[PDB]
């Protein structure tokens, strides 16, 4: 019972399909961008009909840049005009004579799906980088110039979403200590992780080991998902938001030691204010989560990924008699591991037509 | 024409104000860090202002799929509150009296048992992890549950990475020459080798005189003589790594025949610029900062465990002779001459506010 | 009936006789070295046998296609000439007297004295997930003949001389004033209510074999059930010369599932003989021998004088009784607290004849 | 120009033919031993012709069977009456049959993998343990049947060749051989640091190896002398646990280390029979008395074989002995050295028909 999702150009001329809204990068490859565009016959009688692919970083509402184009023609046919996957040939069969097949490739060069849209705390303006599927019309009333009508086209903002990939990184690891001014004795923090790659909504164990040598009372253990942002074109904008935050009941006293798994699961849900942090998608879309982890390729320039997007735990250790009297600095360490979706699974169907446009809330 | 350096916190509650970036560590006393944090007494309402002095010692930097790693020891910890206030410096009214009644003052003092500004960032040749002792003065706001709990806001606060420079003490008495000498015995006949320097205490930029004289009474003739100045670091905190590394050479190649003898004055200069490469090397600052400069030599006070240090640096002269007269395999003698190297001694109304950001090259 | 231990050099010119293998050291003082060379005068012709006592801190291993790595500091070196004699050992002994009879006047007089500041037979070699490298603390006994020329060249004939590896074993002090307890007790708050964890055990010193009774009293005014309590004797070792390297590995272990529920208070007595036999890994710990020898057993606890630089013992090692309570959330995955009490482990306080004649070579197993 | 070895029997009925005395080991595979016998066709009517290859250990003798003997390898073809085809597997079996006439039969015997190479040792005054060694032996022999159903291998119907399995170095190597080894000797508060690197893993019988020393002498003592030593051990691992460690190379360095400095020098060395005068308490491929005999070979033990059946071990090493002034009888009753392991062996090996010289098989002597 596949879902198709269709959009109309306002002159009704063109008429898109895609499979899905959102396309698969598993680092080892990208999903292309397989469609048709049913045409109008008698309306694009002489018309040129094709479809790009865009990828382009924004800044501000000011800037921009292009990362990657593509486009193929759709009508007149071309060539055999027959489909290279069986979700065209079965749309072909389905919609009639007038459907003709496009195939965009993504490379492997490109970042995902990831925008910002700062809070009031803020400084640095709203960004993000964009995949557009367009189907337009182009035209010649006269040989001086091709036009192309805004009213014969049609753009979807579809998603480019990170899946993981076959590997996966070492176990995280991360050992800290301390010597106050004063203390003979050493604060000692080793935390770990179970994994170095999670999917959205799986919980994250962070496995905490405090050995406390010290005189001092360790009064709260504190264990945070930071996601940390940096825009990387035009702007050198820096942002680090908790999206997760687990608080132990636990103290340790002095001349002990303590070890406790704290499980946080970082979630758009979980954050009331959703500006300030890097999203996958617009705030009011019901189907934006959290931007996945940043996957800069081997050779690849980091700055053409246009927002780098990493995740990290900090584990904060609250210290007796230390705040004020021998430190004005915070005790903690951090620990990276990257967010994204899980691994991709390896006659005709039976097809639902709906509007692209994503549901809100 | 005295240039004030100038920070102000995120949230613009708390702006910090300094004489100067780095403050003289001239043996018999160092000169304290006197200034003063200009508020917003709206966005200070309720609060007490405070201005703290560390001096940390670090270990361990960031590597990907290796388990992180950290050690710190606090080495020196003051704090004095602000605002609302509780002797005074003619630089400390000057700026009150020119920049408003929302400035108040500061004085905090350095004890006599602290290392100076050393950092050391590892070669790929290198088997040691990053470390350095750091100094921070510290400006920051509280409210009353902020002392109920352990809580310091991150964006009413402003930090400054200020150096501790060595410098050489006021009324030395004068120096003798650093010197020894050898006698290298081949077939029971000497290859006497005497080292001299003007003296024992050379400033930073100083051209160092290296006095080498060979009296050859073998049947082997001296090939080449080499003269370096070796920087030696010794990590005593957490790790005890080892940094040797030439910051200046002299290839003479000057040959000393059977029963001759030959005197040669040469002159280094050890300079962190005299090298591309300034990963391995003991520096007094970070690496990509303009004002950075090669390591003073420690001094340790009698009485003072070498160990409060964190980071030993000293300098040598090394003279290689390459010897032969077998037939050819030529054999390598080589030696040393300790000195000190530090910044010279010092002697004894109207701003322009500089941001503390120190230049880059 | 004494059993007196002999070993003969290869050119069989040489032989010499100690009292024991091994040699006390009580805090207090140090056995001393009595022993005698009977050497035949026709094979050492106008030469001078000499013996040595050397303490020896080494460092590395010899691994194939690995660069080869070592490090020798000698922490005491002592010399007397034998043959001919002099007065070099002063008054003869007990034991020298009569050796000397039943071996002829073929025999001499030799007496080696232990200084103060010396450690006690300690070495280790490291398990597969160990970082550093085999190192001990070597006590050397060398009987050795020289001529005039010998000393001169750096020739000393391994042929006409003869080592013993002996130990220098702690005992614990004749002058002991009666031991008090050693107890601690912990509050680990748990959402602002006392997990109480008080350990004690009879006394501070335990001797090799002995039984150590650990008393554990839970006093649980938390939310939260102790599932498990675990108490282990660990041996802490610390390399102090060349390379600082940190062994601690469970020697003794005991594992009792017992429930402490809230509102309610848990006293148990667990005892542990931490032994090597207990330990079928005999690397990875610190020995008072080599783990092929069957008289070797684990390393008693370093005893630093007062004013001695710890470093100069060569290796450090220390016991402590780690106990180690698993608490349940409120539940998907529990807690764990632990604590130790430090204790000292030695071997006990010290107390014309028949000989028996003996090799030195070490019984293996 | 082809130098074929040849014995014939006392009786003359028996002729062994080889185209060498010695066969190359090289760790991959062993040359097999490829020969001709040829026959007085009158003396074997009736008998049949065999050839042995027989690798044996002894120690005590080198008569009345008075010695231990262990037997590591026997194999045995027959070339008379003929077998099968009778024809060559080697050109050189093919050249030999031509030039030699019809009466002359083709053998090959093969080495498997997991024998030493000739090892052998007569002891010096100095040493306790006997004479030993690994021999081979190729023995042509003839058997004939009597009336009373027993047959006969007469000795004057045979001949023995003791043929030498020589090491050749394999395609690859081990790593760089390096050492360091420092010292703080009672009393000091600095370290004697000596390190020692040769050019490489494997050397050459007659290779000069380059041993270079890096001297860091911050003591307040004089390293008065360097001595450099090829040192080697021989550990007999059949019957008697007999150990012998000799220097068979040395070379003394006219340079002194004074306090407080270091010296960096590479000393020469080449480990050969020849430079020791001294023949006996030393491994050798073969007897005192033979002028073709070297020093043994660095044994090499193959994964999985037992290192007993290779009844010999022998290995090499670099031992640098450093004298400190004012040390011995004073600081210590120990040597100061380190020791570097090499491996020592012979180098790595690679239409018309030969032109045969016959030579008696007989090792010449040394005269
Ligand atoms: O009319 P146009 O020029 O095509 O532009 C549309 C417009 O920007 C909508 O706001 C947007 O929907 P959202 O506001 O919900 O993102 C839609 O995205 P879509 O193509 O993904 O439906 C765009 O195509
Ligand atoms: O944002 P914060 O909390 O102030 O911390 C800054 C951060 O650690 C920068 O890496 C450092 O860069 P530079 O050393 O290159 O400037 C800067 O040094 P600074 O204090 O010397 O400016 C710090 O202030
Ligand atoms: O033959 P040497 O040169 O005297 O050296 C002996 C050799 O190192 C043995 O391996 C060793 O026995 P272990 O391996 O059993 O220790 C013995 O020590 P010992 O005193 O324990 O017999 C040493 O004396
Ligand atoms: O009479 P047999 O049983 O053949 O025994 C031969 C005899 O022992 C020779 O002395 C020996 O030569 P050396 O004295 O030179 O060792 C020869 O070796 P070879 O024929 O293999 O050379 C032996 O085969
Ligand atoms: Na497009
Ligand atoms: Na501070
Ligand atoms: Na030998």
Redesign the interface.
Known sequence: NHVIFKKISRDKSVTIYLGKRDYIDHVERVEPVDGVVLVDPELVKGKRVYVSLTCAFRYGQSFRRDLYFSQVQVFPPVGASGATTRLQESLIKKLGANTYPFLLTFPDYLPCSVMLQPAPQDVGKSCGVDFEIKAFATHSTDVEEDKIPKKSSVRLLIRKVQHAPRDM??QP?????????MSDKPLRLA?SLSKEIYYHGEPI?VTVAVTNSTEKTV??IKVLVEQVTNVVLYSSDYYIKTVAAEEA?????????????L?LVPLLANNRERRGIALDGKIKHEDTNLASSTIIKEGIDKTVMGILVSYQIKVKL??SG?????????VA????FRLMHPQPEDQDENFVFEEFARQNL
């Not at 230390?322 to 915070?330: A, D, F, N, V």
Request: aromatic share 6%; charged share 25%.
């Open positions: 990184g070492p690891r991360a050992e800290a200590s301390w010597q106050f001014f935390v164990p009064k709260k009941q636990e103290k340790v006293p002095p001349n002990s030691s303590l070890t406790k798994t499980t609250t210290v230390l705040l004020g009297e021998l430190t004005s600095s915070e360490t951090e620990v990276p």
